Amino acid sequence: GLTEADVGITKFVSSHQGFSGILKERYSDFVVHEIGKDGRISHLNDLSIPVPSEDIFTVLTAEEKQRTSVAIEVIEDTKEKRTIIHQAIKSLFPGLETKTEDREGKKYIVAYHWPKSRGSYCHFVLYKENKDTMDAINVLSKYLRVKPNIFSYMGTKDKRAITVQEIAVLKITAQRLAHLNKCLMNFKLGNFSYQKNPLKLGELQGNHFTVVLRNITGTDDQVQQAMNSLKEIGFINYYGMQRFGAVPTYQVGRAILQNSWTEVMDLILKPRSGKGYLVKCREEWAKTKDPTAALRKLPVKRCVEGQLLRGLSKYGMKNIVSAFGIIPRNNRLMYIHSYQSYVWNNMVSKRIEDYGLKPVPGDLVLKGATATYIEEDDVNNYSIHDVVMPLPGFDVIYPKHKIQEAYREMLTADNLDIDNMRHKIRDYSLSGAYRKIIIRPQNVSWEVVAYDDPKIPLFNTDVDNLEGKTPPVFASEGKYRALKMDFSLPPSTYATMAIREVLKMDTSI
């Protein structure tokens, strides 16, 4: 329903003829490896627990001392070797009795009933398949009987994909985490270390992508030209379709900024084209206009519709400001940020159309963390990769060319004032920020692969390598053709926008 043109995604970098290709046909055709603060590319490649009773038996005995018996096998049997185990168990045995048993030749030691030197945080790699980051944290939180806020990460990674990232957890041992691997299906944990600090959102350097575009209709000339342009110049740094949502998020954001609160409520709760349970909740709302009656139709507690319905039950339909205010702050800002994103995509497309892919006088540039202007005389000292455009807000400056006039027109068309982007409600006041218009991906590599079966993955994942799965080998000719790409992107960048530039085809399905 919502197209790329609807959200201002209309321009391309390369002049090459577009071609077709299938994206995320299998979640194994889209693989993401996080690039850490220090440049390390997270891979699940070590299951060792950092340093007679191994890590498992110690966990088994600790689990026994709290909430029948723990039998430890005596590998190299000796009177001194058995007593050593009795004494070693007695160290990690607060309230545990110990007895030697000879079970038909095989001997056992049967158990009956955080250092300040070691950093507070266990860091580890989380490998996930078709899952959200928060979803993995909730599973680990319920298994470890902890609250999800003791976990930290640098960013969330795509659900429909195989993703690998670093996670930190306050005061949970590596053995406790590793033990969970036996009962976790769509996630695995490894690469354990103990460190001083948690992770911080946005601290990452970016992500590395391995992408398989199935059934490419492109020729070798088309592919080479598409890839060379992506490697040399790159792609227009648009906000992808994910930024815009079922409910078109920028429209809720616009209504919030205009203080059109009845419209905010209707946009979230009223029935619309294209999740089954949300359809029923919205139908019950349209029929009864009763929060209690519509809440009965929601199987999920933490969702925007439920939080707003709980807010309306508390404050009523004559105080939608307070009712909506109940939604967590992060979910509320997301609407107004996607409105800023909508304006930004449109402005960038106008900037490309009117001045091209060259820095022009009047453009804003980023000299480290400071934003400044390109003048007539210093125009040739900058590249298109230094050019920034602002997300609209009260604290930003605008380019000194005609796009400033276009920002003013777009904002005026929504009854908003570029000269005063302050909201009467503090939470909805936007300061603005700067975003690069063109991104050159790093460590770009590609190959066209001939194949016959779509089910067959074209490369190993981290778990395939751990299990010692045979690396895929492919013939020089086949029925179908695939474009296999590898590239690194900075944070707040969309891989779909890089793929869009290669294929020159719109993101629908």
How does DSSP classify residue 180? G
SS3 state at 13: coil
Which residue, among 236, 229, 239, 238, has the nearest Cα to 444 in the 3D structure? Answer: 229
Cα 265 to Cα 317: distance, rounded to the nearest angstrom: 9
Which residue, among 509, 482, 484, 507, has the nearest Cα to 494 in the 3D structure? Answer: 507
Which residue, among 382, 389, 383, 369, has the nearest Cα to 434 in the 3D structure? Answer: 389
Q: Which residues contact 204 (CB under 8 A, 6 or more apart)?
A: 34, 35, 36, 37, 154, 155, 491
Residues of the domain holding 295: 245-327
Judge whether 40 lies within some domain: no
Q: What is the CATH number of the domain that holds 125?
A: 3.30.70.3160
89 and 122 share one domain? no
431 and 344 share one domain? yes
CB burial of 3-40 (b: ≥16 within 10 Å; e: otherwise) equals ebeebbbbbebbebebbebbbbbbbbbbbbbbbbeeee
Experiment type:
X-ray
Please spell the DSSP secondary structure of 285-345, one letter per residue: HHHH--HHHHHTT---SSSHHHHHHHHHHHH-TT-HHHHHTTS-HHHHHHHHHHHHHHHHH
Give the residue from 327, 345, 364 where a domain finishes: 327
User: Which tokens in the block code for residue 326?
Assistant: 């109940």
Cα 499 to Cα 150: distance, rounded to the nearest angstrom: 36
Residue type present at position 129: E
338 and 429 share one domain? yes
User: Which tokens in the block code for residue 21?
Assistant: 């290709």
67 and 84 share one domain? yes
- Strand duo 364-367 + 370-373: pairing: antiparallel
Judge whether 44 lies within some domain: no
User: Which tokens in the block code for residue 310?
Assistant: 């709980």
Judge whether 224 lies within some domain: yes
147 and 170 share one domain? yes
Cα 448 to Cα 423: distance, rounded to the nearest angstrom: 52
Separation in Å, CA 340 to CA 14, 235, 321, 410: 26, 20, 20, 11
Judge whether 508 lies within some domain: no
Q: Which residues contact 217 (CB under 8 A, 6 or more apart)?
A: 19, 20, 21
Catalytic position from the list 29, 132, 135, 158: 158
SS3 state at 54: coil
**Ramachandran bin of 9, using left for φ above 0, alpha for ψ from -120 to 50, beta for the remaining angles:** beta
Beta bridge mates, 208: 33, 488
**Would residue 158 show up in a list of annotated catalytic residues for this protein?**
yes
Judge whether 42 lies within some domain: no
Which residue, among 266, 225, 222, 226, has the nearest Cα to 247 in the 3D structure? Answer: 266
Judge whether 167 lies within some domain: yes
Judge whether 446 lies within some domain: no
The count of structural domains within the chain is 5
- The answer to whether the beta carbons of residues 179 and 171 sit under 8 Å apart is no
Judge whether 257 lies within some domain: yes
Residue type present at position 184: L
- Residue 163 sits at the vertex; the CA angle it makes with 159 and 169, to the nearest 5 degrees, is 95
Please spell the DSSP secondary structure of 428-461, one letter per residue: G----EEEESEE--EEEEEEEEEES-TTS-SS--
Cα 104 to Cα 101: distance, rounded to the nearest angstrom: 9
Cα 374 to Cα 383: distance, rounded to the nearest angstrom: 11
Q: Which residues contact 430 (CB under 8 A, 6 or more apart)?
A: 336, 340, 391, 392, 393, 394, 421, 423
335 and 315 share one domain? no
338 and 420 share one domain? yes
User: Which tokens in the block code for residue 106?
Assistant: 């095989």
Give the residue from 305, 327, 349 where a domain finishes: 327
Give the residue from 286, 302, 327 where a domain finishes: 327
